[PDB]
Amino acid sequence: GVRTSPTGEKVTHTGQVYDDGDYRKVRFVGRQKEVNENFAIDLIAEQPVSQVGSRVISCDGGGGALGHPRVYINLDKETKTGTCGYCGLQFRQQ
Amino acid sequence: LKKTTGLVGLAVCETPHERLKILYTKILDVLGHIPKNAAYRKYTEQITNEKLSMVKAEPDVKKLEERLQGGQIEEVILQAENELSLARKMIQWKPWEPLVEEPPASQWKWPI
């Protein structure tokens, strides 16, 4: 989700960008502004919702002990998905 | 006789039985100037008399060193001299007197 301000400075995934009158952008003259191009908020929105056949599902983020702490997610509400608090994966009940 | 005590700066004693008798006797002499009830006198006389008795009952130095349990006989002579020097200082300090002063109320309270 990299976009540039009218001055041409890249906006980071945290929304940071020096405004027009900020002297501090002089630090980038002759150099460059380090911006990571892989915005996590965009990438997690690409993952499909997982359909499960139960009211409660668990997520450990994958990879077993290489993931995150195992949490159990309630899927009773039919107007929204269950989202994992750690990794952002989404679940919905059939 | 032994060629070395093994400890740097500690010379071999030629006549250790006679040296110890002199020192243990001197110690009991200095102790007589300490009050009768003082714990230093009572305990020091007790251990000094134990040591003096072993020295009077064991002509063999190696077997006496085993009885005294204080290292080389030259180490025991050195300890006898430290006691005698200590005893003389005790006379001036008089530690057997009552506690000079009580600490403030929470001086030794831990944690705070």
């Binding site: 501090r24 | 929470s106 309270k109 705070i112």
Partner: protein, 125 residues
């Protein structure tokens, strides 16, 4: 050979503290309030001495919080307010003392939950 010294104990000249951080500081002597997020009372036992808060500003390079106050993080613990006051006086700090707040004893009765004729009767459990 004791000597008699009737003067007040004042060690400001031999503590090495610069002048501005003696005369211009205001020490606060208090028992910290219980953290309302928890019911444990173990952090309200002792008396604390802390100094007045001074400026913090954003470092131009990183945005970190900068300070010029050498006492910004100085917190001293004391068994009694009297010990804290004594310590503040000999160091020459002007101070404020706040009386310890202790919860007043409450009258609790589980039976009152079911009163025949009083408003203490609970509507649910």
């Amino acid at each position: 050979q004791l000597i008699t010294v009737d003067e007040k104990l004042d060690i400001t000249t031999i503590t090495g503290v610069p002048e501005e951080h003696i005369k211009t500081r205001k020490a606060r002597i208090f028992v910290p309030a219980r953290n309302n997020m928890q019911s444990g009372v173990n952090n309200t036992k002792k008396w604390k001495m802390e100094f007045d808060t001074r400026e913090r500003w954003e470092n131009p390079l990183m945005g970190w919080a900068s300070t010029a106050d050498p006492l910004s993080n100085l917190v001293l613990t004391f068994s009694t307010k009297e010990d804290a006051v004594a310590f503040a006086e000999k160091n020459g700090w002007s101070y404020d003392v706040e009386e310890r707040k202790v919860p007043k004893p409450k009258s609790k009765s589980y039976g009152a939950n079911f009163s025949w004729n009083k408003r203490t009767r609970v509507s649910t459990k």
